[PDB]
Amino acid sequence: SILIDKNTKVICQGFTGSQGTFHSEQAIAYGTKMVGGVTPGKGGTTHLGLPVFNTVREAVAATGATASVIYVPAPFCKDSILEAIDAGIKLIITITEGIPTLDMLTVKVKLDEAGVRMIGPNCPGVITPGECKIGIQPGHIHKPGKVGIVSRSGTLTYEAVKQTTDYGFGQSTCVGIGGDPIPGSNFIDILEMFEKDPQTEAIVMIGEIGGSAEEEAAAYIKEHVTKPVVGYIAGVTAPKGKRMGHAGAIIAGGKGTADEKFAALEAAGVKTVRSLADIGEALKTV
Amino acid sequence: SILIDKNTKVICQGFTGSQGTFHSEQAIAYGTKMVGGVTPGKGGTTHLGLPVFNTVREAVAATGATASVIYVPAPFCKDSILEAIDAGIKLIITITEGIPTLDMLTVKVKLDEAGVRMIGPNCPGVITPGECKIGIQPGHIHKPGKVGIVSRSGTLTYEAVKQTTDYGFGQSTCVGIGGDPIPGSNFIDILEMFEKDPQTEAIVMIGEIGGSAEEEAAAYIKEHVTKPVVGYIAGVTAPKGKRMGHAGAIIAGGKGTADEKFAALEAAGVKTVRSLADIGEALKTV
Amino acid sequence: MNLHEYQAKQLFARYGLPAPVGYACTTPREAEEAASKIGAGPWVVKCQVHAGGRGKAGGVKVVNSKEDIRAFAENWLGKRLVTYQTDANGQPVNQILVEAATDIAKELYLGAVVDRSSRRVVFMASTEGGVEIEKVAEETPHLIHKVALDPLTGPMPYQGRELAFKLGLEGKLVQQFTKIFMGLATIFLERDLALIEINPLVITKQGDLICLDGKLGADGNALFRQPDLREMRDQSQEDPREAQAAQWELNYVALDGNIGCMVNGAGLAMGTMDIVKLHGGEPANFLDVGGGATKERVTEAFKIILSDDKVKAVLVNIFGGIVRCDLIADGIIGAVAEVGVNVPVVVRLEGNNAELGAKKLADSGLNIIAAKGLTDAAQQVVAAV
Amino acid sequence: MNLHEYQAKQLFARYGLPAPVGYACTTPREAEEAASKIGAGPWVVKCQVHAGGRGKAGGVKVVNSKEDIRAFAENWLGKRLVTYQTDANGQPVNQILVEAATDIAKELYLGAVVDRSSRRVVFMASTEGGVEIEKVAEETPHLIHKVALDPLTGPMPYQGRELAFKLGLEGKLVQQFTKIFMGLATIFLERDLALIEINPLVITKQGDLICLDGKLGADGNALFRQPDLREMRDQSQEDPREAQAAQWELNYVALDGNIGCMVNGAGLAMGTMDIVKLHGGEPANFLDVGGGATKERVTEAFKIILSDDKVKAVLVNIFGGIVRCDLIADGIIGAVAEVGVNVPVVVRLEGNNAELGAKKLADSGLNIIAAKGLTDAAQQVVAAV
Ligand SMILES: *SCCNC(=O)CCNC(=O)[C@H](O)C(C)(C)COP(=O)(O)OP(=O)(O)OC[C@H]1O[C@@H](n2cnc3c(N)ncnc32)[C@H](O)[C@@H]1OP(=O)(O)O
Ligand SMILES: *SCCNC(=O)CCNC(=O)[C@H](O)C(C)(C)COP(=O)(O)OP(=O)(O)OC[C@H]1O[C@@H](n2cnc3c(N)ncnc32)[C@H](O)[C@@H]1OP(=O)(O)O
Ligand SMILES: Nc1ncnc2c1ncn2[C@@H]1O[C@H](COP(=O)(O)OP(=O)(O)O)[C@@H](O)[C@H]1O
Ligand SMILES: Nc1ncnc2c1ncn2[C@@H]1O[C@H](COP(=O)(O)OP(=O)(O)O)[C@@H](O)[C@H]1O
Ligand SMILES: [Mg+2]
Ligand SMILES: [Mg+2]
């Protein structure tokens, strides 16, 4: 179990909005400890039976929450991923899609320098079966287990989740790091949190075209990962120089193809599965 | 005979250009008294055997010319129509098409205040058969006669010219006032020059949709035109709110249709011909 | 050239004129999100088409919830809207404007154009806001006040105050109205416009002036010196061929009849269409052949006239020009056999070699008729239908 | 989003970077007239398409007479140009740039992008001008120098000099090169750009630096705060459907195979296409269904996938989502109807009521196959071809 658990208290920014409401209502029912939300100009009211504040600080005082999930429109996202960091929140989850690349670029630098953690932005999600859920995903395909999963694609995770529920195994905790080109925490940052964790026996790493955090994770694995890893890369049929949905799923000037990622992920001592059907089948071999 | 004659000396601005050359070469063969041209930066040379100057003033000195024909690109037209006026030329003919409406609007005001005359802009033309030609038209369909013609369309003139050549009559002098919405001289200004002229026995006035100088001419005719007039209006089948080729041939908010022009041109005591085929036939009746 | 509502309001903002707060939107989601960046309800969602009378066609509604905004955007993006100012087809809605609802106290009309007649830029104001000025003009002309801009001095305050007064405003509503007058007047001269129409120019309950809708027209002849405007043209609102024809120096316009015309010169072009209507035919278009009938130019000219299935005959009519009337016939023939022309073609030439050119067409053996003069060519095409 | 050559040179002029003198032209005549406003010959005429390698495709010629310019414009306006960076179709030439010929002494390369790897904006310079940087990169990597913009301080003059020096410039050519560096760098951060590429950055015989060509890429995500740029997009260069699909929150891309895919989520979408290639089929496109498969959204999704004649089967694959897998089947059926789908459709559902939704499709009596899981649905469509 990593990142969160039944004891993690959470506040949500942009709590009074459509997606904010709908997705909180769910985390409320799965039993996540949502303690209240923030929406400037509406402080001093109640929403889903929880309290609503004007600032991220007013909240972190009155509740002592340590993680925040953001459902705020791109144009203002940078301003609240930052207000969070200032009121000293230690775990930031940002759903929002469409944040300007140069905004993230600046934001990341602050994120490291102040020692804070953000997962996302652009449809991420983090769930520890039975205990906690912050994200947009369906909770009934999961079963408390022993496998860890990191993935850029959100939906590809659902496929790998179910295969491991169906083969008994179970998931320790699931991390979707988001599709943008410059994420708040990448593979290596999450791969390490697993290794050092007991509840997790093996790892499923899901990547796709564009960039090189897949490659880099490889190198870091041969050298510092003791547990076993099963990997899957999406996007072989994909054309060059076109963006396939995800802001960061593009092959720029020949770098970051499907194949290299597989290749270099192999010579690292990982078991590559070429059809996301045999994911379960490959885990059986451990 | 009005505006010009075998004794009118002419200089052409934008004399060294494509259209400038081609069209001068013609006026030079029809025997028009072209005495030289102007092109900034090329003064001190010879072109079609005539002398080329740097400024319109250097020209008007060295030649004593009193009319200038302009073949200069829209973007700079206003600047030379103006330069002409300042070196005191008294008759300006501007072929150029595409001069910004607000440019003409200002230019017209100067043209009145200083007492100068401009015919055009946008494909006009002035020819007195046998004697003079400044314009782009073909000289062999004309025959020295007794009819005067004013028209907004250039090509419609050619039709009316030939009909009057074929019925013996002849043309005194032909004036095409141009198609733009704000011309340098309109119908009334030219209608008067005829009346006061001996060589011209009757008049053919050719108009078209858009504006109201046709209407106004009417009123001025009943009241101050003694000679007889045959009129033709083009554009009945024309749609509302679309510009038909000519910058000023457009029906804006229901004003200036084909019909009203005919109508109000009738009750003025003019003989309206509904098919530009019966133009000659109608002149026969005088 | 015409401009969109949102582009005008955007230009207004730069010169400091007041407009409501809003955002241009290309997707349901963007529109939906705009609600909160704006403020509290309600909001006005408007289709962005060049034509007017959107109001009476259900293209402008006031809504109250985030999802009513969505719903609206889904129902219009990607579809054509037909007002009483468009043709059976309508114009394509590609953007939704979502702006704040304004408290309306009284609707005025403010506008301006170039008066060919008096040769000045003229501004008109009226108490009759929210309606076709044209109606008020013929029906109640005494309710439309005007002032004319002096080209020696540019706009001046007193003119602004003057209208302001005939409109019966008083107090601060006058200073404001003058500000707007001097503003629009400036934009008019600076951006080389051909027309302006703020209708309705509203007076809020709170007692302020504010532009609720804008129609801007720019002078095509001046685009070379208005680069910013050059970029705002939206080809999707005009007939694709109109533009396709300009690339080849051809002035095209579609009507709805069965006989096509290809004539050289705008006067002769309108003249011809009229003489075809005169003998019972319906001209199907107006096409002016600009720079001499070269082989290629004529071709494209056909290519275009014939993209209309309703055509059943084509009338060519060339007089003068810069081409030997024989190379024109040469081109016409080539043009026909290469495009694959079905209908009957009636050429009418006049000028040089004009009578051998006619022969070259009668010998050709295709379906081409050399007409003897104007009144003939007329009846001949009218006949072949 | 991409920008045209002339638009980039226009932006360059605003920040004071040097570019040759030229004018954007939309008609033969306009181009022709430009010759003289420019100066004495010769002149360079260039097609304005988004892609590059126009040089080797005969899209950029140096000419010497007013009519050679005309000729060129008549030959390209209105036609598609195909370089080695476009597809069989090519991109439509709607404007010609006509600018002054520059005396070339030596061609350099200057460019910049966002390095996902080191997380910084990076500028690259090289002595190898006039050629694909990608080649020089894999073939002679020690010839491409770089510097990285610090996000705490913005660009700094020394960085500009360091490159300037590794390039072996000296004297005033350094000050100039630094000016350009600080400029492009500023434009990069201010207009929210994603990429820049001045190739070739020339050194005139007269010893001055000058930008001869520019490729600009803007960050789509930021258009809401770069209104000026929002206006410069030219839909005519991209696949019309791509845009037509965005209006309905659908991400589309055309490939060239025979099996269509409609999947929800970009990952699963790429995942699926790969598993169809795995069993001998050719995916014909990538289509991600954004906001839940409502009846309408699915329809348009088909409407689009099927506008391609090459398709001979469609593979739907929905997992999870915000819709009860039964209303999805309901919509799929209703979609197959309204559209008039002739090929075989293979649905694959997973989630709620997934059980009965499948039945509702087997009962429907159309050509629809409820597959049992992933590896099945695969073979089933691969089979029906
Ligand atoms: S990832 C799953 C699939 N989704 C996608 O691919 C699309 C992801 N969607 C987005 O990225 C949208 O940008 C999100 C952020 C989800 C927003 O959509 P909503 O429709 O929920 O947005 P609303 O406008 O309805 O609500 C937003 C609320 O946020 C408040 N707000 C503004 N500024 C702030 C700051 N700085 N801090 C906190 N809250 C803030 C708005 O006022 C609004 O609340 P209201 O109740 O509407 O006033
Ligand atoms: S009306 C008949 C049918 N025509 C139409 O419908 C189109 C009408 N054509 C036009 O309006 C063109 O704008 C005209 C003016 C005809 C010009 O076409 P050209 O091809 O002749 O233009 P060129 O560039 O070849 O020649 C123009 C010359 O003018 C000189 N020039 C510029 N500025 C001035 C001023 N202020 N005064 C005098 N001459 C001026 C240019 O230098 C050029 O001469 P070069 O020899 O080319 O240097
Ligand atoms: N921002 C707004 N706030 C309030 N009412 C508005 C607003 N915009 C438009 N309206 C109302 O809608 C009517 C029609 O809008 P308008 O923009 O004039 O569309 P159109 O001219 O195409 O009919 C206005 O006369 C006004 O009553
Ligand atoms: N203004 C100019 N003056 C001189 N040569 C030019 C000019 N513009 C382009 N060229 C020449 O044409 C070549 C290709 O032009 P470029 O604009 O780089 O097109 P592309 O990148 O699409 O191939 C240049 O490398 C240069 O030699
Ligand atoms: Mg209105
Ligand atoms: Mg290049």
mmCIF file of N, CA and C in Angstrom, chain C residues 130-197:
data_model
loop_
_atom_site.group_PDB
_atom_site.id
_atom_site.type_symbol
_atom_site.label_atom_id
_atom_site.label_comp_id
_atom_site.label_asym_id
_atom_site.label_seq_id
_atom_site.Cartn_x
_atom_site.Cartn_y
_atom_site.Cartn_z
ATOM 1 N N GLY C 130 -33.971 47.717 -31.179
ATOM 2 C CA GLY C 130 -34.436 46.346 -31.236
ATOM 3 C C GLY C 130 -35.229 46.033 -32.483
ATOM 4 N N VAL C 131 -34.957 46.737 -33.565
ATOM 5 C CA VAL C 131 -35.733 46.487 -34.755
ATOM 6 C C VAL C 131 -35.061 46.971 -36.037
ATOM 7 N N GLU C 132 -35.486 46.403 -37.167
ATOM 8 C CA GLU C 132 -34.930 46.743 -38.470
ATOM 9 C C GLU C 132 -34.958 48.188 -38.738
ATOM 10 N N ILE C 133 -33.797 48.792 -38.851
ATOM 11 C CA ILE C 133 -33.818 50.196 -39.073
ATOM 12 C C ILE C 133 -34.575 50.509 -40.340
ATOM 13 N N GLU C 134 -34.384 49.695 -41.372
ATOM 14 C CA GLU C 134 -35.055 49.923 -42.650
ATOM 15 C C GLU C 134 -36.530 50.169 -42.479
ATOM 16 N N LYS C 135 -37.172 49.421 -41.587
ATOM 17 C CA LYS C 135 -38.599 49.630 -41.353
ATOM 18 C C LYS C 135 -38.802 51.033 -40.785
ATOM 19 N N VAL C 136 -38.214 51.303 -39.632
ATOM 20 C CA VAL C 136 -38.360 52.610 -39.039
ATOM 21 C C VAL C 136 -38.111 53.733 -40.036
ATOM 22 N N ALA C 137 -37.176 53.525 -40.952
ATOM 23 C CA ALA C 137 -36.846 54.547 -41.945
ATOM 24 C C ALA C 137 -37.979 54.917 -42.908
ATOM 25 N N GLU C 138 -38.591 53.916 -43.547
ATOM 26 C CA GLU C 138 -39.685 54.168 -44.494
ATOM 27 C C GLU C 138 -41.019 54.472 -43.772
ATOM 28 N N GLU C 139 -41.219 53.854 -42.606
ATOM 29 C CA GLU C 139 -42.434 53.996 -41.806
ATOM 30 C C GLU C 139 -42.488 55.203 -40.875
ATOM 31 N N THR C 140 -41.352 55.549 -40.255
ATOM 32 C CA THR C 140 -41.285 56.690 -39.331
ATOM 33 C C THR C 140 -39.952 57.437 -39.445
ATOM 34 N N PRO C 141 -39.607 57.924 -40.650
ATOM 35 C CA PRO C 141 -38.339 58.637 -40.849
ATOM 36 C C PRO C 141 -37.989 59.766 -39.862
ATOM 37 N N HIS C 142 -38.961 60.272 -39.118
ATOM 38 C CA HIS C 142 -38.665 61.379 -38.225
ATOM 39 C C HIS C 142 -38.084 60.946 -36.908
ATOM 40 N N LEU C 143 -37.818 59.649 -36.791
ATOM 41 C CA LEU C 143 -37.249 59.104 -35.556
ATOM 42 C C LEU C 143 -35.800 58.613 -35.722
ATOM 43 N N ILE C 144 -35.193 59.033 -36.819
ATOM 44 C CA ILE C 144 -33.830 58.682 -37.103
ATOM 45 C C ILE C 144 -33.030 59.957 -37.294
ATOM 46 N N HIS C 145 -32.222 60.289 -36.291
ATOM 47 C CA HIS C 145 -31.403 61.501 -36.332
ATOM 48 C C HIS C 145 -30.015 61.194 -36.885
ATOM 49 N N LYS C 146 -29.416 62.156 -37.584
ATOM 50 C CA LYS C 146 -28.115 61.938 -38.179
ATOM 51 C C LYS C 146 -27.211 63.126 -38.043
ATOM 52 N N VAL C 147 -25.908 62.876 -38.179
ATOM 53 C CA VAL C 147 -24.845 63.893 -38.140
ATOM 54 C C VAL C 147 -23.835 63.385 -39.152
ATOM 55 N N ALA C 148 -23.058 64.275 -39.768
ATOM 56 C CA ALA C 148 -22.077 63.821 -40.770
ATOM 57 C C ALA C 148 -20.655 64.196 -40.407
ATOM 58 N N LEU C 149 -19.754 63.228 -40.433
ATOM 59 C CA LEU C 149 -18.376 63.512 -40.085
ATOM 60 C C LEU C 149 -17.635 64.426 -41.090
ATOM 61 N N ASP C 150 -17.057 65.531 -40.600
ATOM 62 C CA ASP C 150 -16.304 66.461 -41.456
ATOM 63 C C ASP C 150 -14.948 65.889 -41.807
ATOM 64 N N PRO C 151 -14.641 65.775 -43.102
ATOM 65 C CA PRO C 151 -13.314 65.211 -43.325
ATOM 66 C C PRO C 151 -12.135 66.133 -42.988
ATOM 67 N N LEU C 152 -12.411 67.339 -42.528
ATOM 68 C CA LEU C 152 -11.321 68.248 -42.217
ATOM 69 C C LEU C 152 -10.983 68.180 -40.770
ATOM 70 N N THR C 153 -11.963 67.813 -39.964
ATOM 71 C CA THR C 153 -11.785 67.807 -38.534
ATOM 72 C C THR C 153 -11.988 66.507 -37.817
ATOM 73 N N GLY C 154 -12.466 65.485 -38.500
ATOM 74 C CA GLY C 154 -12.682 64.236 -37.789
ATOM 75 C C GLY C 154 -13.879 64.411 -36.867
ATOM 76 N N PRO C 155 -14.237 63.380 -36.094
ATOM 77 C CA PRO C 155 -15.377 63.497 -35.196
ATOM 78 C C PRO C 155 -15.059 64.475 -34.116
ATOM 79 N N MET C 156 -16.107 65.122 -33.628
ATOM 80 C CA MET C 156 -16.002 66.121 -32.594
ATOM 81 C C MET C 156 -17.121 65.915 -31.620
ATOM 82 N N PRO C 157 -16.884 66.183 -30.330
ATOM 83 C CA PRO C 157 -17.832 66.056 -29.229
ATOM 84 C C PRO C 157 -19.248 66.558 -29.512
ATOM 85 N N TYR C 158 -19.362 67.851 -29.820
ATOM 86 C CA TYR C 158 -20.659 68.468 -30.084
ATOM 87 C C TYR C 158 -21.630 67.611 -30.924
ATOM 88 N N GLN C 159 -21.086 66.797 -31.808
ATOM 89 C CA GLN C 159 -21.912 65.978 -32.652
ATOM 90 C C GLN C 159 -22.439 64.883 -31.794
ATOM 91 N N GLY C 160 -21.575 64.406 -30.917
ATOM 92 C CA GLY C 160 -21.983 63.329 -30.053
ATOM 93 C C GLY C 160 -23.056 63.778 -29.098
ATOM 94 N N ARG C 161 -22.849 64.963 -28.508
ATOM 95 C CA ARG C 161 -23.801 65.518 -27.548
ATOM 96 C C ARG C 161 -25.113 65.710 -28.252
ATOM 97 N N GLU C 162 -25.056 66.333 -29.420
ATOM 98 C CA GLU C 162 -26.250 66.607 -30.207
ATOM 99 C C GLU C 162 -27.247 65.459 -30.419
ATOM 100 N N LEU C 163 -26.715 64.284 -30.715
ATOM 101 C CA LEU C 163 -27.543 63.110 -30.924
ATOM 102 C C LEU C 163 -28.023 62.737 -29.571
ATOM 103 N N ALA C 164 -27.062 62.733 -28.659
ATOM 104 C CA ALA C 164 -27.309 62.384 -27.288
ATOM 105 C C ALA C 164 -28.564 63.107 -26.833
ATOM 106 N N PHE C 165 -28.677 64.383 -27.192
ATOM 107 C CA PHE C 165 -29.828 65.171 -26.770
ATOM 108 C C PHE C 165 -31.109 64.899 -27.499
ATOM 109 N N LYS C 166 -31.049 64.796 -28.822
ATOM 110 C CA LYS C 166 -32.262 64.511 -29.579
ATOM 111 C C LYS C 166 -32.848 63.177 -29.117
ATOM 112 N N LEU C 167 -32.016 62.371 -28.476
ATOM 113 C CA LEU C 167 -32.473 61.094 -27.994
ATOM 114 C C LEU C 167 -33.115 61.241 -26.617
ATOM 115 N N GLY C 168 -33.026 62.443 -26.045
ATOM 116 C CA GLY C 168 -33.610 62.699 -24.736
ATOM 117 C C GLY C 168 -32.911 62.063 -23.533
ATOM 118 N N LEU C 169 -31.590 61.975 -23.588
ATOM 119 C CA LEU C 169 -30.839 61.421 -22.484
ATOM 120 C C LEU C 169 -30.459 62.641 -21.700
ATOM 121 N N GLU C 170 -30.086 62.458 -20.445
ATOM 122 C CA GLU C 170 -29.661 63.599 -19.651
ATOM 123 C C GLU C 170 -28.764 63.116 -18.533
ATOM 124 N N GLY C 171 -27.909 64.009 -18.056
ATOM 125 C CA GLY C 171 -27.051 63.642 -16.953
ATOM 126 C C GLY C 171 -25.788 62.983 -17.410
ATOM 127 N N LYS C 172 -25.354 61.953 -16.695
ATOM 128 C CA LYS C 172 -24.133 61.282 -17.070
ATOM 129 C C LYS C 172 -24.327 60.455 -18.337
ATOM 130 N N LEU C 173 -25.570 60.067 -18.626
ATOM 131 C CA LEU C 173 -25.857 59.282 -19.830
ATOM 132 C C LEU C 173 -25.442 60.022 -21.093
ATOM 133 N N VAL C 174 -25.102 61.290 -20.943
ATOM 134 C CA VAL C 174 -24.691 62.051 -22.093
ATOM 135 C C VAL C 174 -23.205 61.913 -22.300
ATOM 136 N N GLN C 175 -22.436 62.054 -21.231
ATOM 137 C CA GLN C 175 -20.989 61.913 -21.319
ATOM 138 C C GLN C 175 -20.698 60.556 -21.932
ATOM 139 N N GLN C 176 -21.342 59.536 -21.384
ATOM 140 C CA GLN C 176 -21.167 58.192 -21.859
ATOM 141 C C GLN C 176 -21.481 58.063 -23.336
ATOM 142 N N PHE C 177 -22.657 58.518 -23.718
ATOM 143 C CA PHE C 177 -23.020 58.431 -25.113
ATOM 144 C C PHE C 177 -21.994 59.148 -26.021
ATOM 145 N N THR C 178 -21.425 60.245 -25.559
ATOM 146 C CA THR C 178 -20.442 60.934 -26.366
ATOM 147 C C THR C 178 -19.187 60.079 -26.517
ATOM 148 N N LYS C 179 -18.790 59.415 -25.438
ATOM 149 C CA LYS C 179 -17.586 58.583 -25.430
ATOM 150 C C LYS C 179 -17.724 57.525 -26.500
ATOM 151 N N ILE C 180 -18.872 56.884 -26.517
ATOM 152 C CA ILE C 180 -19.116 55.864 -27.510
ATOM 153 C C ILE C 180 -19.102 56.454 -28.938
ATOM 154 N N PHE C 181 -19.744 57.610 -29.110
ATOM 155 C CA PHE C 181 -19.761 58.213 -30.423
ATOM 156 C C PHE C 181 -18.340 58.466 -30.894
ATOM 157 N N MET C 182 -17.556 59.179 -30.108
ATOM 158 C CA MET C 182 -16.193 59.431 -30.523
ATOM 159 C C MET C 182 -15.393 58.127 -30.765
ATOM 160 N N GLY C 183 -15.732 57.082 -30.007
ATOM 161 C CA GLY C 183 -15.044 55.806 -30.154
ATOM 162 C C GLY C 183 -15.349 55.133 -31.484
ATOM 163 N N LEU C 184 -16.581 54.662 -31.657
ATOM 164 C CA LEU C 184 -16.959 54.045 -32.902
ATOM 165 C C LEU C 184 -16.492 54.894 -34.106
ATOM 166 N N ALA C 185 -16.643 56.197 -34.002
ATOM 167 C CA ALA C 185 -16.244 57.060 -35.077
ATOM 168 C C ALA C 185 -14.774 56.889 -35.316
ATOM 169 N N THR C 186 -13.998 56.810 -34.248
ATOM 170 C CA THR C 186 -12.588 56.617 -34.495
ATOM 171 C C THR C 186 -12.384 55.258 -35.196
ATOM 172 N N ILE C 187 -12.804 54.164 -34.566
ATOM 173 C CA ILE C 187 -12.645 52.848 -35.162
ATOM 174 C C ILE C 187 -13.042 52.871 -36.620
ATOM 175 N N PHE C 188 -14.059 53.637 -36.961
ATOM 176 C CA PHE C 188 -14.506 53.634 -38.344
ATOM 177 C C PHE C 188 -13.418 54.094 -39.281
ATOM 178 N N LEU C 189 -12.789 55.208 -38.929
ATOM 179 C CA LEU C 189 -11.765 55.758 -39.776
ATOM 180 C C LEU C 189 -10.479 55.026 -39.684
ATOM 181 N N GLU C 190 -10.136 54.567 -38.495
ATOM 182 C CA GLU C 190 -8.881 53.874 -38.325
ATOM 183 C C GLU C 190 -8.873 52.472 -38.942
ATOM 184 N N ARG C 191 -9.937 51.702 -38.803
ATOM 185 C CA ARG C 191 -9.894 50.362 -39.361
ATOM 186 C C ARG C 191 -10.447 50.250 -40.737
ATOM 187 N N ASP C 192 -10.670 51.388 -41.374
ATOM 188 C CA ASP C 192 -11.195 51.368 -42.728
ATOM 189 C C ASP C 192 -12.454 50.509 -42.810
ATOM 190 N N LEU C 193 -13.517 50.937 -42.132
ATOM 191 C CA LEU C 193 -14.769 50.188 -42.135
ATOM 192 C C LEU C 193 -15.719 50.685 -43.193
ATOM 193 N N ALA C 194 -16.715 49.892 -43.481
ATOM 194 C CA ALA C 194 -17.657 50.307 -44.476
ATOM 195 C C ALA C 194 -18.983 50.515 -43.804
ATOM 196 N N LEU C 195 -19.159 49.909 -42.629
ATOM 197 C CA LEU C 195 -20.412 50.005 -41.880
ATOM 198 C C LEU C 195 -20.360 49.551 -40.401
ATOM 199 N N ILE C 196 -21.179 50.173 -39.542
ATOM 200 C CA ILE C 196 -21.267 49.810 -38.118
ATOM 201 C C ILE C 196 -22.729 49.769 -37.714
ATOM 202 N N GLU C 197 -23.091 48.891 -36.785
ATOM 203 C CA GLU C 197 -24.474 48.822 -36.361
ATOM 204 C C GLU C 197 -24.587 48.177 -34.995
#
